[PDB]
Amino acid sequence: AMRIVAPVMPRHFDEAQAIDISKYEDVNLIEWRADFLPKDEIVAVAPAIFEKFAGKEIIFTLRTVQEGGNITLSSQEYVDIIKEINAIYNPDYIDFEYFTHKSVFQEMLDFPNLILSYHNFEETPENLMEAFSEMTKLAPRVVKIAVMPQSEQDVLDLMNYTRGFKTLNPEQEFATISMGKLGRLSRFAGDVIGSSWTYVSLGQVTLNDMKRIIEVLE
Amino acid sequence: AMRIVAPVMPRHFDEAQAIDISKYEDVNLIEWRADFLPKDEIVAVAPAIFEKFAGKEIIFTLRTVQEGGNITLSSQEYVDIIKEINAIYNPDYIDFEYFTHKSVFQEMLDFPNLILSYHNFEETPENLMEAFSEMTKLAPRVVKIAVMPQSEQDVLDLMNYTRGFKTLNPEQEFATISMGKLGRLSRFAGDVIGSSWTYVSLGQVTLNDMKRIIEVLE
Ligand SMILES: [Mg+2]
Numbered sequence: 001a002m003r004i005v006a007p008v009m010p011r012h013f014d015e016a017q018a019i020d021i022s023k024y025e026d027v028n029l030i031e032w033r034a035d036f037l038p039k040d041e042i043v044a045v046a047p048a049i050f051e052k053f054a055g056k057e058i059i060f061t062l063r064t065v066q067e068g069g070n071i072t073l074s075s076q077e078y079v080d081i082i083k084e085i086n087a088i089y090n091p092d093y094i095d096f097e098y099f100t101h102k103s104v105f106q107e108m109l110d111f112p113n114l115i116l117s118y119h120n121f122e123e124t125p126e127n128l129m130e131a132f133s134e135m136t137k138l139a140p141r142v143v144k145i146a147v148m149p150q151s152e153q154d155v156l157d158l159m160n161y162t163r164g165f166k167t168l169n170p171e172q173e174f175a176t177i178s179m180g181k182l183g184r185l186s187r188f189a190g191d192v193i194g195s196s197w198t199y200v201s202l203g204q205v206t207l208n209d210m211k212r213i214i215e216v217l218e
Numbered sequence: 219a220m221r222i223v224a225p226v227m228p229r230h231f232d233e234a235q236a237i238d239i240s241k242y243e244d245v246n247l248i249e250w251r252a253d254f255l256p257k258d259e260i261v262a263v264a265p266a267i268f269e270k271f272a273g274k275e276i277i278f279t280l281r282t283v284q285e286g287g288n289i290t291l292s293s294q295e296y297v298d299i300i301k302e303i304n305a306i307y308n309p310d311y312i313d314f315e316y317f318t319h320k321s322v323f324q325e326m327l328d329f330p331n332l333i334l335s336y337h338n339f340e341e342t343p344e345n346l347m348e349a350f351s352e353m354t355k356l357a358p359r360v361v362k363i364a365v366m367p368q369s370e371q372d373v374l375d376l377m378n379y380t381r382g383f384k385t386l387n388p389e390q391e392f393a394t395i396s397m398g399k400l401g402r403l404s405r406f407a408g409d410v411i412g413s414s415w416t417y418v419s420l421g422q423v424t425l426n427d428m429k430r431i432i433e434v435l436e
């Protein structure tokens with residue numbers, strides 16, 4: 001069934017320490033958006049995140065600038081930070097920006113818990129099927145794709161691609177959305193399309209709106 | 219933009235007369251489901267319907283048994299009742315079950331205000347594109363199609379067919395849905411797919427749930 005993913009994004013240590021866990025009571029999957037920190041504070045802030053959310057599963061996500069994130073890193077810095085956090089903290093899942101940082105993907109080959117991710121804020125690309133195929137054939141823990149529609153048909157394409165790949169790979173977990181106001185319908189289509197990880201806020205949708213929609217759709 | 223269609227379905231005259239119009243305040247399009255009456259009471263009940271809803275546009279719908287309705291009529295009886303109601307009352311729109319009563323469609327050729335309708339409660343048929351094409355090429359006032367999905371892909375097919383036909387015929391108004399719990403997503407997809415007439419209740423969805431969804435999608 002559907003899994004709700006809620007982000008945690010402290011900008012410093014005093015903030016991370018100060019987080020209210022009761023805010024996350026309805027959620028068992030936490031995404032630490034480590035890109036909200038300066039690169040030199042990520043490892044310092046990790047203990048607070050892992051200690052606070054010890055009751056939940058934790059995703060380590062270093063969302064980099066080319067993928068819409070708040071940190072600018074070389075692919076080398078990127079993989080080095082991921083591996084250091086991994087070696088010490090053992091996050092349940094690790095986000096890897098497959099296309100942006102493909103040059104260092106060979107360093108990540110042995111990980112069974114990757115969320116292979118791809119975000120396109122410009123368009124729904126003409127080779128989207130090929131992107132699904134390449135990511136799905138790797139059989140990561142999750143295939144995560146977010147694309148910007150430039151027409152209503154773009155939104156339907158995202159939905160139909162997810163359904164086709166899910167039907168061919170029923171054991172593969174997907175988190176796929178069409179972004180923007182235009183693509184918002186796709187955010188409530190996970191049960192139809194085969195997208196089971198739902199990224200929410202506490203285009204973008206809150207947990208409250210999600211619940212209300214899941215109500216009507218059951 | 220979207221038009222909400224609310225049904226009126228009295229089973230006798232005392233009932234029709236007794237209807238509370240304030241229930242329909244948010245709605246400017248009324249569907250008189252005349253099939254809830256015995257055939258010999260439809261014309262007797264019409265004055266009450268047309269007088270009560272004089273402020274709104276009115277659809278005359280004789281939904282027959284093979285299309286999921288509450289009356290059993292020959293195609294001849296069907297067209298005769300429609301034409302009598304039309305001659306006296308001038309309904310703003312008339313529903314015509316294009317496939318079920320095709321044998322008498324020649325009698326309806328000159329009407330510019332038809333809702334050509336098709337309901338399949340068994341499946342999403344393999345020639346659905348052909349059904350869209352035949353109905354759309356007639357350029358009725360509305361093409362109305364409701365089909366039962368037997369898989370998630372069936373729901374997406376209904377949605378993609380509507381979008382393709384809408385894009386090719388942007389002046390054509392559509393009212394298309396995938397039925398059941400499975401197809402419920404399609405009921406909130408009208409803006410994406412190009413379905414602008416929304417049939418509600420006061421799978422099936424109420425005006426209240428609709429409003430709440432239109433809120434989130436804008
Ligand atoms: Mg380890």
Ligand SMILES: [Mg+2]
Pocket residue numbers: 304305308
């Ligand atoms: Mg007339």
